JSON list of C-alpha atoms in Angstrom, two decimals:
[
{"chain": "P", "resi": 17, "resn": "UNK", "atom": "CA", "xyz": [136.63, 88.85, 122.80]},
{"chain": "P", "resi": 18, "resn": "UNK", "atom": "CA", "xyz": [133.01, 90.24, 121.81]},
{"chain": "P", "resi": 19, "resn": "UNK", "atom": "CA", "xyz": [133.92, 93.47, 124.10]},
{"chain": "P", "resi": 20, "resn": "UNK", "atom": "CA", "xyz": [136.63, 94.31, 121.16]},
{"chain": "P", "resi": 21, "resn": "UNK", "atom": "CA", "xyz": [134.29, 95.04, 119.04]},
{"chain": "P", "resi": 22, "resn": "UNK", "atom": "CA", "xyz": [133.26, 98.21, 120.87]},
{"chain": "P", "resi": 23, "resn": "UNK", "atom": "CA", "xyz": [136.83, 99.80, 120.38]},
{"chain": "P", "resi": 24, "resn": "UNK", "atom": "CA", "xyz": [137.33, 99.22, 116.29]},
{"chain": "P", "resi": 25, "resn": "UNK", "atom": "CA", "xyz": [136.80, 103.34, 116.02]},
{"chain": "P", "resi": 26, "resn": "UNK", "atom": "CA", "xyz": [136.78, 105.99, 117.84]},
{"chain": "P", "resi": 27, "resn": "UNK", "atom": "CA", "xyz": [135.24, 106.05, 121.07]},
{"chain": "P", "resi": 28, "resn": "UNK", "atom": "CA", "xyz": [133.92, 108.83, 123.59]},
{"chain": "P", "resi": 29, "resn": "UNK", "atom": "CA", "xyz": [135.24, 109.21, 126.83]},
{"chain": "P", "resi": 30, "resn": "UNK", "atom": "CA", "xyz": [133.91, 110.73, 129.93]},
{"chain": "P", "resi": 31, "resn": "UNK", "atom": "CA", "xyz": [136.40, 111.22, 132.91]},
{"chain": "P", "resi": 32, "resn": "UNK", "atom": "CA", "xyz": [134.62, 112.08, 136.18]},
{"chain": "P", "resi": 33, "resn": "UNK", "atom": "CA", "xyz": [137.34, 112.58, 139.55]},
{"chain": "P", "resi": 34, "resn": "UNK", "atom": "CA", "xyz": [136.50, 113.09, 142.90]},
{"chain": "P", "resi": 35, "resn": "UNK", "atom": "CA", "xyz": [139.53, 114.27, 144.91]},
{"chain": "P", "resi": 36, "resn": "UNK", "atom": "CA", "xyz": [140.40, 114.12, 148.84]},
{"chain": "P", "resi": 37, "resn": "UNK", "atom": "CA", "xyz": [144.31, 115.53, 149.25]},
{"chain": "P", "resi": 38, "resn": "UNK", "atom": "CA", "xyz": [145.03, 115.84, 152.87]},
{"chain": "P", "resi": 39, "resn": "UNK", "atom": "CA", "xyz": [141.46, 117.34, 153.12]},
{"chain": "P", "resi": 40, "resn": "UNK", "atom": "CA", "xyz": [141.74, 119.41, 150.35]},
{"chain": "P", "resi": 41, "resn": "UNK", "atom": "CA", "xyz": [138.65, 118.51, 147.82]},
{"chain": "P", "resi": 42, "resn": "UNK", "atom": "CA", "xyz": [138.59, 119.41, 144.13]},
{"chain": "P", "resi": 43, "resn": "UNK", "atom": "CA", "xyz": [136.93, 117.55, 141.46]},
{"chain": "P", "resi": 44, "resn": "UNK", "atom": "CA", "xyz": [138.02, 117.10, 137.60]},
{"chain": "P", "resi": 45, "resn": "UNK", "atom": "CA", "xyz": [135.87, 116.68, 134.71]},
{"chain": "P", "resi": 46, "resn": "UNK", "atom": "CA", "xyz": [137.31, 115.49, 131.57]},
{"chain": "P", "resi": 47, "resn": "UNK", "atom": "CA", "xyz": [136.23, 114.59, 128.17]},
{"chain": "P", "resi": 48, "resn": "UNK", "atom": "CA", "xyz": [137.69, 113.72, 124.75]},
{"chain": "P", "resi": 49, "resn": "UNK", "atom": "CA", "xyz": [138.39, 110.26, 122.68]},
{"chain": "P", "resi": 50, "resn": "UNK", "atom": "CA", "xyz": [140.05, 107.15, 122.13]},
{"chain": "P", "resi": 51, "resn": "UNK", "atom": "CA", "xyz": [140.98, 105.29, 119.73]},
{"chain": "P", "resi": 52, "resn": "UNK", "atom": "CA", "xyz": [142.37, 101.65, 119.88]},
{"chain": "P", "resi": 53, "resn": "UNK", "atom": "CA", "xyz": [143.18, 100.54, 116.67]},
{"chain": "P", "resi": 54, "resn": "UNK", "atom": "CA", "xyz": [146.15, 103.51, 117.33]},
{"chain": "P", "resi": 55, "resn": "UNK", "atom": "CA", "xyz": [146.31, 103.16, 121.19]},
{"chain": "P", "resi": 56, "resn": "UNK", "atom": "CA", "xyz": [145.26, 106.76, 120.65]},
{"chain": "P", "resi": 57, "resn": "UNK", "atom": "CA", "xyz": [143.77, 109.20, 123.46]},
{"chain": "P", "resi": 58, "resn": "UNK", "atom": "CA", "xyz": [143.18, 112.56, 123.01]},
{"chain": "P", "resi": 59, "resn": "UNK", "atom": "CA", "xyz": [141.60, 114.37, 126.66]},
{"chain": "P", "resi": 60, "resn": "UNK", "atom": "CA", "xyz": [141.08, 117.29, 128.18]},
{"chain": "P", "resi": 61, "resn": "UNK", "atom": "CA", "xyz": [140.29, 118.09, 132.01]},
{"chain": "P", "resi": 62, "resn": "UNK", "atom": "CA", "xyz": [139.39, 120.60, 133.94]},
{"chain": "P", "resi": 63, "resn": "UNK", "atom": "CA", "xyz": [139.19, 121.51, 137.63]},
{"chain": "P", "resi": 64, "resn": "UNK", "atom": "CA", "xyz": [135.76, 122.51, 138.40]},
{"chain": "P", "resi": 65, "resn": "UNK", "atom": "CA", "xyz": [136.53, 123.57, 142.19]},
{"chain": "P", "resi": 66, "resn": "UNK", "atom": "CA", "xyz": [139.32, 126.19, 141.32]},
{"chain": "P", "resi": 67, "resn": "UNK", "atom": "CA", "xyz": [142.91, 125.37, 141.12]},
{"chain": "P", "resi": 68, "resn": "UNK", "atom": "CA", "xyz": [143.92, 121.81, 141.19]},
{"chain": "P", "resi": 69, "resn": "UNK", "atom": "CA", "xyz": [145.64, 121.55, 144.75]},
{"chain": "P", "resi": 70, "resn": "UNK", "atom": "CA", "xyz": [148.06, 118.96, 143.28]},
{"chain": "P", "resi": 71, "resn": "UNK", "atom": "CA", "xyz": [150.19, 118.84, 139.92]},
{"chain": "P", "resi": 72, "resn": "UNK", "atom": "CA", "xyz": [148.47, 117.62, 136.91]},
{"chain": "P", "resi": 73, "resn": "UNK", "atom": "CA", "xyz": [151.08, 115.21, 135.75]},
{"chain": "P", "resi": 74, "resn": "UNK", "atom": "CA", "xyz": [150.26, 113.26, 139.82]},
{"chain": "P", "resi": 75, "resn": "UNK", "atom": "CA", "xyz": [146.89, 112.81, 137.82]},
{"chain": "P", "resi": 76, "resn": "UNK", "atom": "CA", "xyz": [147.77, 110.86, 134.36]},
{"chain": "P", "resi": 77, "resn": "UNK", "atom": "CA", "xyz": [147.70, 107.72, 135.47]},
{"chain": "P", "resi": 78, "resn": "UNK", "atom": "CA", "xyz": [144.58, 108.17, 137.66]},
{"chain": "P", "resi": 79, "resn": "UNK", "atom": "CA", "xyz": [142.67, 109.68, 134.76]},
{"chain": "P", "resi": 81, "resn": "UNK", "atom": "CA", "xyz": [141.53, 103.67, 130.56]},
{"chain": "P", "resi": 82, "resn": "UNK", "atom": "CA", "xyz": [143.99, 101.45, 129.32]},
{"chain": "P", "resi": 83, "resn": "UNK", "atom": "CA", "xyz": [140.99, 99.78, 127.04]},
{"chain": "P", "resi": 84, "resn": "UNK", "atom": "CA", "xyz": [142.14, 102.17, 124.57]},
{"chain": "P", "resi": 85, "resn": "UNK", "atom": "CA", "xyz": [145.66, 100.47, 124.16]},
{"chain": "P", "resi": 86, "resn": "UNK", "atom": "CA", "xyz": [146.37, 98.85, 120.54]},
{"chain": "P", "resi": 87, "resn": "UNK", "atom": "CA", "xyz": [147.22, 95.18, 120.94]},
{"chain": "P", "resi": 88, "resn": "UNK", "atom": "CA", "xyz": [148.64, 93.79, 118.35]},
{"chain": "P", "resi": 89, "resn": "UNK", "atom": "CA", "xyz": [146.53, 91.14, 116.45]},
{"chain": "P", "resi": 90, "resn": "UNK", "atom": "CA", "xyz": [148.98, 88.58, 118.05]},
{"chain": "P", "resi": 91, "resn": "UNK", "atom": "CA", "xyz": [148.63, 89.69, 121.38]},
{"chain": "P", "resi": 92, "resn": "UNK", "atom": "CA", "xyz": [144.58, 90.09, 121.06]},
{"chain": "P", "resi": 93, "resn": "UNK", "atom": "CA", "xyz": [143.90, 86.89, 123.56]},
{"chain": "P", "resi": 94, "resn": "UNK", "atom": "CA", "xyz": [145.88, 88.64, 126.36]},
{"chain": "P", "resi": 95, "resn": "UNK", "atom": "CA", "xyz": [143.47, 91.90, 126.76]},
{"chain": "P", "resi": 96, "resn": "UNK", "atom": "CA", "xyz": [141.85, 91.92, 129.36]},
{"chain": "P", "resi": 97, "resn": "UNK", "atom": "CA", "xyz": [140.66, 95.36, 129.56]},
{"chain": "P", "resi": 98, "resn": "UNK", "atom": "CA", "xyz": [138.35, 95.38, 126.24]},
{"chain": "P", "resi": 99, "resn": "UNK", "atom": "CA", "xyz": [137.23, 91.59, 127.34]},
{"chain": "P", "resi": 100, "resn": "UNK", "atom": "CA", "xyz": [135.87, 93.05, 129.94]},
{"chain": "P", "resi": 101, "resn": "UNK", "atom": "CA", "xyz": [133.40, 95.43, 128.58]},
{"chain": "P", "resi": 102, "resn": "UNK", "atom": "CA", "xyz": [130.78, 97.15, 127.97]},
{"chain": "P", "resi": 103, "resn": "UNK", "atom": "CA", "xyz": [130.12, 95.90, 131.92]},
{"chain": "P", "resi": 104, "resn": "UNK", "atom": "CA", "xyz": [133.64, 97.15, 132.62]},
{"chain": "P", "resi": 105, "resn": "UNK", "atom": "CA", "xyz": [136.44, 97.10, 135.05]},
{"chain": "P", "resi": 106, "resn": "UNK", "atom": "CA", "xyz": [136.99, 98.15, 138.95]},
{"chain": "P", "resi": 107, "resn": "UNK", "atom": "CA", "xyz": [140.72, 99.68, 139.13]},
{"chain": "P", "resi": 108, "resn": "UNK", "atom": "CA", "xyz": [142.50, 100.08, 142.48]},
{"chain": "P", "resi": 109, "resn": "UNK", "atom": "CA", "xyz": [145.87, 101.47, 142.88]},
{"chain": "P", "resi": 110, "resn": "UNK", "atom": "CA", "xyz": [148.04, 102.38, 145.57]},
{"chain": "P", "resi": 111, "resn": "UNK", "atom": "CA", "xyz": [150.54, 105.26, 144.69]},
{"chain": "P", "resi": 112, "resn": "UNK", "atom": "CA", "xyz": [153.49, 106.06, 146.85]},
{"chain": "P", "resi": 113, "resn": "UNK", "atom": "CA", "xyz": [155.25, 109.52, 145.95]},
{"chain": "P", "resi": 114, "resn": "UNK", "atom": "CA", "xyz": [158.97, 109.05, 147.39]},
{"chain": "P", "resi": 115, "resn": "UNK", "atom": "CA", "xyz": [159.53, 111.07, 150.54]},
{"chain": "P", "resi": 116, "resn": "UNK", "atom": "CA", "xyz": [156.21, 112.10, 150.60]},
{"chain": "P", "resi": 117, "resn": "UNK", "atom": "CA", "xyz": [152.46, 111.22, 150.70]},
{"chain": "P", "resi": 118, "resn": "UNK", "atom": "CA", "xyz": [150.32, 108.34, 148.47]},
{"chain": "P", "resi": 119, "resn": "UNK", "atom": "CA", "xyz": [147.12, 108.12, 146.70]},
{"chain": "P", "resi": 120, "resn": "UNK", "atom": "CA", "xyz": [144.74, 105.54, 147.07]},
{"chain": "P", "resi": 121, "resn": "UNK", "atom": "CA", "xyz": [141.89, 105.82, 143.92]},
{"chain": "P", "resi": 122, "resn": "UNK", "atom": "CA", "xyz": [139.23, 103.08, 143.21]},
{"chain": "P", "resi": 123, "resn": "UNK", "atom": "CA", "xyz": [137.74, 103.82, 139.94]},
{"chain": "P", "resi": 124, "resn": "UNK", "atom": "CA", "xyz": [135.02, 102.11, 137.32]},
{"chain": "P", "resi": 125, "resn": "UNK", "atom": "CA", "xyz": [135.49, 102.13, 133.87]},
{"chain": "P", "resi": 126, "resn": "UNK", "atom": "CA", "xyz": [132.71, 101.08, 131.80]},
{"chain": "P", "resi": 127, "resn": "UNK", "atom": "CA", "xyz": [130.57, 101.48, 129.10]},
{"chain": "P", "resi": 128, "resn": "UNK", "atom": "CA", "xyz": [127.54, 104.10, 130.17]},
{"chain": "P", "resi": 129, "resn": "UNK", "atom": "CA", "xyz": [125.43, 104.16, 127.17]},
{"chain": "P", "resi": 130, "resn": "UNK", "atom": "CA", "xyz": [127.83, 104.74, 124.47]},
{"chain": "P", "resi": 131, "resn": "UNK", "atom": "CA", "xyz": [130.54, 107.03, 125.77]},
{"chain": "P", "resi": 132, "resn": "UNK", "atom": "CA", "xyz": [133.78, 104.72, 127.93]},
{"chain": "P", "resi": 133, "resn": "UNK", "atom": "CA", "xyz": [133.34, 105.97, 131.55]},
{"chain": "P", "resi": 134, "resn": "UNK", "atom": "CA", "xyz": [136.18, 106.22, 134.04]},
{"chain": "P", "resi": 135, "resn": "UNK", "atom": "CA", "xyz": [134.79, 107.64, 137.17]},
{"chain": "P", "resi": 136, "resn": "UNK", "atom": "CA", "xyz": [137.23, 107.81, 140.11]},
{"chain": "P", "resi": 137, "resn": "UNK", "atom": "CA", "xyz": [137.25, 108.82, 144.21]},
{"chain": "P", "resi": 138, "resn": "UNK", "atom": "CA", "xyz": [140.88, 109.57, 145.03]},
{"chain": "P", "resi": 139, "resn": "UNK", "atom": "CA", "xyz": [142.08, 109.90, 148.15]},
{"chain": "P", "resi": 140, "resn": "UNK", "atom": "CA", "xyz": [145.61, 111.39, 149.14]},
{"chain": "P", "resi": 141, "resn": "UNK", "atom": "CA", "xyz": [147.30, 111.58, 152.61]},
{"chain": "P", "resi": 142, "resn": "UNK", "atom": "CA", "xyz": [149.88, 112.70, 154.64]},
{"chain": "P", "resi": 143, "resn": "UNK", "atom": "CA", "xyz": [151.67, 114.72, 152.17]},
{"chain": "P", "resi": 144, "resn": "UNK", "atom": "CA", "xyz": [154.09, 117.36, 153.10]},
{"chain": "P", "resi": 145, "resn": "UNK", "atom": "CA", "xyz": [153.38, 121.27, 153.06]},
{"chain": "P", "resi": 146, "resn": "UNK", "atom": "CA", "xyz": [156.38, 122.34, 150.88]},
{"chain": "P", "resi": 147, "resn": "UNK", "atom": "CA", "xyz": [156.99, 118.93, 149.30]},
{"chain": "P", "resi": 148, "resn": "UNK", "atom": "CA", "xyz": [157.03, 118.72, 145.48]},
{"chain": "P", "resi": 149, "resn": "UNK", "atom": "CA", "xyz": [153.43, 117.61, 145.58]},
{"chain": "P", "resi": 150, "resn": "UNK", "atom": "CA", "xyz": [151.45, 120.21, 147.92]},
{"chain": "P", "resi": 151, "resn": "UNK", "atom": "CA", "xyz": [154.08, 122.62, 146.48]},
{"chain": "P", "resi": 152, "resn": "UNK", "atom": "CA", "xyz": [153.67, 122.33, 142.74]},
{"chain": "P", "resi": 153, "resn": "UNK", "atom": "CA", "xyz": [157.04, 121.61, 142.42]},
{"chain": "P", "resi": 154, "resn": "UNK", "atom": "CA", "xyz": [156.61, 119.31, 139.59]},
{"chain": "P", "resi": 155, "resn": "UNK", "atom": "CA", "xyz": [157.66, 120.24, 135.61]},
{"chain": "P", "resi": 156, "resn": "UNK", "atom": "CA", "xyz": [154.31, 120.13, 133.42]},
{"chain": "P", "resi": 157, "resn": "UNK", "atom": "CA", "xyz": [155.68, 117.27, 131.60]},
{"chain": "P", "resi": 158, "resn": "UNK", "atom": "CA", "xyz": [155.10, 113.34, 131.25]},
{"chain": "P", "resi": 159, "resn": "UNK", "atom": "CA", "xyz": [157.68, 110.98, 130.41]},
{"chain": "P", "resi": 160, "resn": "UNK", "atom": "CA", "xyz": [157.56, 107.53, 128.63]},
{"chain": "P", "resi": 161, "resn": "UNK", "atom": "CA", "xyz": [157.14, 104.34, 130.41]},
{"chain": "P", "resi": 162, "resn": "UNK", "atom": "CA", "xyz": [156.52, 100.65, 129.84]},
{"chain": "P", "resi": 163, "resn": "UNK", "atom": "CA", "xyz": [153.46, 99.01, 132.32]},
{"chain": "P", "resi": 164, "resn": "UNK", "atom": "CA", "xyz": [153.78, 95.85, 132.72]},
{"chain": "P", "resi": 165, "resn": "UNK", "atom": "CA", "xyz": [150.59, 93.26, 133.28]},
{"chain": "P", "resi": 166, "resn": "UNK", "atom": "CA", "xyz": [149.87, 90.15, 135.12]},
{"chain": "P", "resi": 167, "resn": "UNK", "atom": "CA", "xyz": [147.30, 88.17, 135.70]},
{"chain": "P", "resi": 168, "resn": "UNK", "atom": "CA", "xyz": [146.04, 87.97, 139.18]},
{"chain": "P", "resi": 169, "resn": "UNK", "atom": "CA", "xyz": [147.20, 84.78, 140.58]},
{"chain": "P", "resi": 170, "resn": "UNK", "atom": "CA", "xyz": [143.98, 84.25, 143.11]},
{"chain": "P", "resi": 171, "resn": "UNK", "atom": "CA", "xyz": [140.73, 86.52, 141.42]},
{"chain": "P", "resi": 172, "resn": "UNK", "atom": "CA", "xyz": [139.74, 86.57, 138.03]},
{"chain": "P", "resi": 173, "resn": "UNK", "atom": "CA", "xyz": [141.59, 89.94, 136.97]},
{"chain": "P", "resi": 174, "resn": "UNK", "atom": "CA", "xyz": [145.27, 91.74, 136.18]},
{"chain": "P", "resi": 175, "resn": "UNK", "atom": "CA", "xyz": [147.81, 93.63, 138.46]},
{"chain": "P", "resi": 176, "resn": "UNK", "atom": "CA", "xyz": [150.62, 95.71, 137.74]},
{"chain": "P", "resi": 177, "resn": "UNK", "atom": "CA", "xyz": [153.37, 97.52, 139.57]},
{"chain": "P", "resi": 178, "resn": "UNK", "atom": "CA", "xyz": [155.45, 100.40, 138.02]},
{"chain": "P", "resi": 179, "resn": "UNK", "atom": "CA", "xyz": [157.21, 103.50, 138.81]},
{"chain": "P", "resi": 180, "resn": "UNK", "atom": "CA", "xyz": [156.44, 106.66, 137.42]},
{"chain": "P", "resi": 181, "resn": "UNK", "atom": "CA", "xyz": [159.04, 109.11, 136.99]},
{"chain": "P", "resi": 182, "resn": "UNK", "atom": "CA", "xyz": [157.75, 112.51, 137.63]},
{"chain": "P", "resi": 183, "resn": "UNK", "atom": "CA", "xyz": [160.44, 115.59, 136.64]},
{"chain": "P", "resi": 184, "resn": "UNK", "atom": "CA", "xyz": [161.08, 118.16, 139.10]},
{"chain": "P", "resi": 185, "resn": "UNK", "atom": "CA", "xyz": [161.55, 121.88, 138.83]},
{"chain": "P", "resi": 186, "resn": "UNK", "atom": "CA", "xyz": [165.50, 121.10, 139.94]},
{"chain": "P", "resi": 187, "resn": "UNK", "atom": "CA", "xyz": [166.22, 118.68, 138.05]},
{"chain": "P", "resi": 188, "resn": "UNK", "atom": "CA", "xyz": [165.73, 116.18, 140.51]},
{"chain": "P", "resi": 189, "resn": "UNK", "atom": "CA", "xyz": [163.24, 112.94, 139.66]},
{"chain": "P", "resi": 190, "resn": "UNK", "atom": "CA", "xyz": [160.88, 111.90, 142.08]},
{"chain": "P", "resi": 191, "resn": "UNK", "atom": "CA", "xyz": [159.45, 107.83, 141.61]},
{"chain": "P", "resi": 192, "resn": "UNK", "atom": "CA", "xyz": [155.33, 107.43, 142.05]},
{"chain": "P", "resi": 193, "resn": "UNK", "atom": "CA", "xyz": [155.48, 103.57, 142.79]},
{"chain": "P", "resi": 194, "resn": "UNK", "atom": "CA", "xyz": [151.98, 102.66, 141.42]},
{"chain": "P", "resi": 195, "resn": "UNK", "atom": "CA", "xyz": [150.61, 99.40, 142.59]},
{"chain": "P", "resi": 196, "resn": "UNK", "atom": "CA", "xyz": [147.38, 98.81, 140.43]},
{"chain": "P", "resi": 197, "resn": "UNK", "atom": "CA", "xyz": [144.62, 95.95, 140.46]},
{"chain": "P", "resi": 198, "resn": "UNK", "atom": "CA", "xyz": [141.54, 95.12, 138.26]},
{"chain": "P", "resi": 199, "resn": "UNK", "atom": "CA", "xyz": [138.56, 92.80, 138.12]},
{"chain": "P", "resi": 200, "resn": "UNK", "atom": "CA", "xyz": [135.83, 92.62, 135.96]},
{"chain": "P", "resi": 201, "resn": "UNK", "atom": "CA", "xyz": [132.69, 94.54, 137.18]},
{"chain": "P", "resi": 202, "resn": "UNK", "atom": "CA", "xyz": [130.60, 91.78, 134.98]},
{"chain": "P", "resi": 203, "resn": "UNK", "atom": "CA", "xyz": [129.84, 87.82, 135.70]},
{"chain": "P", "resi": 204, "resn": "UNK", "atom": "CA", "xyz": [130.95, 87.08, 131.76]},
{"chain": "P", "resi": 205, "resn": "UNK", "atom": "CA", "xyz": [134.36, 85.61, 130.81]},
{"chain": "P", "resi": 206, "resn": "UNK", "atom": "CA", "xyz": [137.28, 87.88, 130.69]},
{"chain": "P", "resi": 207, "resn": "UNK", "atom": "CA", "xyz": [140.71, 87.59, 129.08]},
{"chain": "P", "resi": 208, "resn": "UNK", "atom": "CA", "xyz": [143.76, 86.34, 131.33]},
{"chain": "P", "resi": 209, "resn": "UNK", "atom": "CA", "xyz": [147.00, 87.63, 129.92]},
{"chain": "P", "resi": 210, "resn": "UNK", "atom": "CA", "xyz": [150.27, 86.14, 129.37]},
{"chain": "P", "resi": 211, "resn": "UNK", "atom": "CA", "xyz": [152.76, 88.86, 131.14]},
{"chain": "P", "resi": 212, "resn": "UNK", "atom": "CA", "xyz": [153.52, 91.62, 128.66]},
{"chain": "P", "resi": 213, "resn": "UNK", "atom": "CA", "xyz": [153.54, 95.67, 128.67]},
{"chain": "P", "resi": 214, "resn": "UNK", "atom": "CA", "xyz": [151.98, 98.58, 127.60]},
{"chain": "P", "resi": 215, "resn": "UNK", "atom": "CA", "xyz": [154.35, 101.37, 126.01]},
{"chain": "P", "resi": 216, "resn": "UNK", "atom": "CA", "xyz": [152.60, 104.40, 127.06]},
{"chain": "P", "resi": 217, "resn": "UNK", "atom": "CA", "xyz": [154.11, 107.60, 125.56]},
{"chain": "P", "resi": 218, "resn": "UNK", "atom": "CA", "xyz": [152.33, 110.91, 127.08]},
{"chain": "P", "resi": 219, "resn": "UNK", "atom": "CA", "xyz": [152.11, 114.63, 125.77]},
{"chain": "P", "resi": 220, "resn": "UNK", "atom": "CA", "xyz": [150.88, 117.41, 128.07]},
{"chain": "P", "resi": 221, "resn": "UNK", "atom": "CA", "xyz": [149.55, 120.98, 126.51]},
{"chain": "P", "resi": 222, "resn": "UNK", "atom": "CA", "xyz": [147.00, 123.88, 127.60]},
{"chain": "P", "resi": 223, "resn": "UNK", "atom": "CA", "xyz": [144.51, 125.16, 125.64]},
{"chain": "P", "resi": 224, "resn": "UNK", "atom": "CA", "xyz": [144.60, 128.63, 124.89]},
{"chain": "P", "resi": 225, "resn": "UNK", "atom": "CA", "xyz": [141.23, 129.70, 125.40]},
{"chain": "P", "resi": 226, "resn": "UNK", "atom": "CA", "xyz": [140.56, 127.90, 128.29]},
{"chain": "P", "resi": 227, "resn": "UNK", "atom": "CA", "xyz": [140.51, 130.08, 131.57]},
{"chain": "P", "resi": 228, "resn": "UNK", "atom": "CA", "xyz": [140.03, 127.39, 133.98]},
{"chain": "P", "resi": 229, "resn": "UNK", "atom": "CA", "xyz": [142.80, 124.87, 135.42]},
{"chain": "P", "resi": 230, "resn": "UNK", "atom": "CA", "xyz": [143.40, 122.50, 132.93]},
{"chain": "P", "resi": 231, "resn": "UNK", "atom": "CA", "xyz": [145.47, 119.68, 131.12]},
{"chain": "P", "resi": 232, "resn": "UNK", "atom": "CA", "xyz": [145.13, 118.77, 127.47]},
{"chain": "P", "resi": 233, "resn": "UNK", "atom": "CA", "xyz": [146.79, 114.98, 127.48]},
{"chain": "P", "resi": 234, "resn": "UNK", "atom": "CA", "xyz": [147.52, 113.17, 124.27]},
{"chain": "P", "resi": 235, "resn": "UNK", "atom": "CA", "xyz": [148.64, 109.62, 124.37]},
{"chain": "P", "resi": 236, "resn": "UNK", "atom": "CA", "xyz": [149.56, 106.94, 122.66]},
{"chain": "P", "resi": 237, "resn": "UNK", "atom": "CA", "xyz": [149.74, 103.30, 123.95]},
{"chain": "P", "resi": 238, "resn": "UNK", "atom": "CA", "xyz": [151.04, 99.88, 122.50]},
{"chain": "P", "resi": 239, "resn": "UNK", "atom": "CA", "xyz": [151.15, 96.53, 123.98]},
{"chain": "P", "resi": 240, "resn": "UNK", "atom": "CA", "xyz": [153.97, 94.71, 123.45]},
{"chain": "P", "resi": 241, "resn": "UNK", "atom": "CA", "xyz": [156.30, 91.63, 124.78]},
{"chain": "P", "resi": 242, "resn": "UNK", "atom": "CA", "xyz": [155.02, 88.70, 123.35]},
{"chain": "P", "resi": 243, "resn": "UNK", "atom": "CA", "xyz": [156.20, 87.57, 119.76]}
]
């Protein structure tokens, strides 16, 4: 568990997302810090191409689970830190009920002293006046428990979870995530028993930021094995 030693205090984070949703190209940059000893993340994201052409909350899961707090007794189950500093690939499909889907490929790794999440996101088949292209999601985020399982075929982990996005008319739209992560390096990694990450998020704005942006605060704790 050498990689875990890189997480004993606050670590700078950079996030870069190159997006293309129904051919609408956009870019997001984020910066902040993670403190795995608390399970705490604080980041600010800006859209650098103008207005974000999808709702900010739909990007939260795409925009560093190595910052989860694993209780001492669960530390042998922390795949995410074990893969560091070389990092891991994280790939998802995210299917929005009765609407389109995102497919994402990211690398999460140390680049010098900074933990960097670099993502390409492709979305297709979104509906014109749907909740995504029509920005009908409330600017908020629910708590979710994300179950992690070891990959049965190839040195990584997988997860499947459904995010509940609140819609402006009081409905909820589910985003069904399939996730796979594999190590980038060739060194030993920890393959976990089944457990979950208890993930709380809060979204806000910076009154001084003129660009379209999202301030995110998260607290994430591993659980499910005692």
